């Protein structure tokens, strides 16, 4: 299977340097280009640049010509995006995509999962995870809702999953919102069968990689 | 550099309806145009290449056309899972610049939210804070008014809302409202309630609990 796996999210201070990696597999690395796309929050896709995985030739959009460098580790089928002298405006999610050219048309046919970079003076803070316990007040006949409150973290992102991924149906993970404190908070909820309560174990798995915070919170019923 | 002008910014249509998104190139780009679909929380996916060619593993309901410097993405029959942001891209000469993108949403019938409420956990209360959460599940349209009342006193300034992106199966939204109090303030009151006002509700709905029982 063709895959492009990028390095994880990162928090950097202004003026520092970050190196984002794109580890590819499932195809002949040096027969296809690699290009990078930036997406700042609440903005569209912005094409950044390209590297020839064979010749090493690079080309950048005007905006990114100065502090940005695409490079290779060919033996490892990997491409890198290096950003120097980081600015607050560099906070964004970066994608690498495979660039294919079939002799007629050029396109990004396979994409990495994205890498979220935050540039900030502030230090990282890991979330506190609290249960949203199911009760008579979160029950509707045969369905009950329950969840996790993921509170007070910085920066984005945080990943939330249920029962280590085994539970996906009925899950709503809400967009993070900024609190007055300058920290994010979100909740993840799932609707499940009421008859499963007290029998089916429910655990939300929360991962905040920038702070290295991993929490598995078991959510149990409450009297209400 | 080629500038791509995408139109419109956002677009809403009923299921089964045909939808059209357009892109204008600042110069002739000779049919070298891609469309990408971006579903919420996922990576962009190649949708159309060479202006008119369907990418591998994408629905035949999608097609592309060209008229001079005007490129069109067409969906013959809209399905709920088509909700996404669509991007065109200059693919002739570098830089392969994108258009501004188009948010596609579904129109569906009004749907009343299911309202649930969660009292703060013991673990949180031990830390000195109390977060109360009101959940509005699976409703349409997105517009909803949520109000908090503590011992029947309307709250202001101490709550925050978050709403999901439109659901790819039933085209509904969900919303969480979180009310945050100090533990001290929380324990000075009994009845916590959120009152929900919505198109699908003939009159506003209240979900409430009594502290000390919760």
């Amino acid at each position: 299977q063709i895959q492009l796996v990028q390095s994880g999210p990162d928090l950097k201070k202004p003026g520092e340097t970050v190196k984002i990696s794109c580890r590819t597999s499932g195809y002949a690395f040096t027969n296809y280009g690699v290009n990078w796309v930036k997406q700042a929050p609440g903005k569209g896709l912005k094409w950044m640049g390209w590297i020839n995985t064979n010749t090493g030739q690079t080309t950048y959009a005007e905006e990114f010509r100065g502090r940005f460098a695409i490079s290779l580790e060919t033996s490892a089928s990997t491409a890198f995006l290096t950003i120097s002298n980081l600015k607050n405006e560099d906070s964004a999610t970066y994608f690498c995509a495979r660039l294919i050219y079939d002799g007629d048309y050029i396109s990004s046919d396979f994409w990495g999962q994205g890498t979220t970079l935050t540039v900030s003076s502030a230090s990282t803070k890991g979330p506190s995870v609290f249960p949203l316990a199911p009760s008579s007040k979160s029950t509707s006949g045969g369905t009950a809702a329950l969840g996790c409150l993921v509170k007070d973290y910085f920066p984005e992102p945080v990943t939330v999953s249920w029962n280590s991924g085994a539970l996906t149906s009925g899950v709503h993970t809400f967009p993070a919102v900024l609190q007055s404190s300058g920290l994010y908070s979100l909740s993840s909820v799932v609707t499940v069968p009421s008859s499963s309560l007290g029998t089916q174990t429910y655990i939300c798995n929360v991962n905040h990689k920038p702070s290295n915070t991993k929490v598995d919170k078991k959510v149990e019923p409450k009297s209400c | 550099d080629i500038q791509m002008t995408q139109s419109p910014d956002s677009l809403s249509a009923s299921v089964g309806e045909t939808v059209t998104i357009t892109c204008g190139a600042s110069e002739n780009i000779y049919g070298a145009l891609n469309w990408y679909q971006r579903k919420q929380g996922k990576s962009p996916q190649l949708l159309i290449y060479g202006a008119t060619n369907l990418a591998d593993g994408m629905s035949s309901r999608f097609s592309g056309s060209r008229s001079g410097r005007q490129y069109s993405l067409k969906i013959s029959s809209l399905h709920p899972d088509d909700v996404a942001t669509y991007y065109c891209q200059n693919a002739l000469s570098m830089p392969y610049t994108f258009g501004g993108g188009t948010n596609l949403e579904t129109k569906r019938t009004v749907a009343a939210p299911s309202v649930f409420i969660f009292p703060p956990s013991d673990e949180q209360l031990k830390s000195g804070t109390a977060s109360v959460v009101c959940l509005l599940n699976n409703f349409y349209p997105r517009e909803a008014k949520v109000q908090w009342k503590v011992d029947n006193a309307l709250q202001s300034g101490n709550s925050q809302e978050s709403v999901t992106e439109q659901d790819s199966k039933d085209s509904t939204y969900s919303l969480s409202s979180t009310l945050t109090l100090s533990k001290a303030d929380y324990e000075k009151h009994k009845v916590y309630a959120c009152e929900v006002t919505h198109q699908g509700l003939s009159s506003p709905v209240t979900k409430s609990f009594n502290r000390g029982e919760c």
Binding site: N31, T53, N54, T55, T59 | G31
Partner: peptide, 17 residues
């Protein structure tokens, strides 16, 4: 129009598969 497309790609150094 494949004429121009192929020239532009050539000009940019794009890898053809």
């Amino acid at each position: 129009e494949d004429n121009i497309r192929r020239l532009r790609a050539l000009a940019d150094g794009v890898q053809k598969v």
